[PDB]
């Protein structure tokens with residue numbers, strides 16, 4: 001992997017993996033969540049490609065902010081059809 | 091797997107996988123979160139064994155309740171040293 005290297009380098013907040021299969025909400029996802037949930041975003045690693053289905057791939061991001069807001073932003077992503085999970089829970 | 095079969099049979103709330111490596115908080119975890127976060131718990135699948143390290147294994151549970159409370163219960167588990175993630179995000 002090794003996802004714990006991301007946790008090691010980016011300790012604060014939560015690190016999440018976002019998946020894009022082309023079904024995600026057609027809006028500016030990252031700015032949308034920044035503004036709505038008052039979270040900061042740092043891109044750690046990613047691979048996204050444009051396909052006929054739309055943007056497809058993965059993004060690992062660090063979210064910073066109040067705990068409740070980070071949690072809400074993560075469920076927000078999921079509801080916007082971006083599968084999201086906090087790394088380090090396997 | 092197939093974790094989506096759990097989502098199919100238990101549609102409401104969130105389905106989470108909890109991991110126990112023996113480092114988890116030494117308290118009655120499931121009742122603790124039920125009471126603190128006002129969530130309901132249904133066990134879907136699990137394999138837990140007692141070892142010299144303590145209780146080790148996994149539990150898949152359905153959490154029911156208000157969205158914010160479910161989210162808080164999930165982070166609560168993590169803080170209590172039970173690695174937890176919402177299934178269906180791979």
Ligand SMILES: [Zn+2]
Nearest residue numbers: 019020021083
């Ligand atoms: Zn997707």
Ligand SMILES: [Zn+2]
Nearest residue numbers: 032033036076
């Ligand atoms: Zn929104």
Ligand SMILES: [Zn+2]
Nearest residue numbers: 085090175180
């Ligand atoms: Zn996982």
Ligand SMILES: [Zn+2]
Nearest residue numbers: 109110111173
């Ligand atoms: Zn553990």
Ligand SMILES: [Zn+2]
Nearest residue numbers: 122123126166
């Ligand atoms: Zn507690």
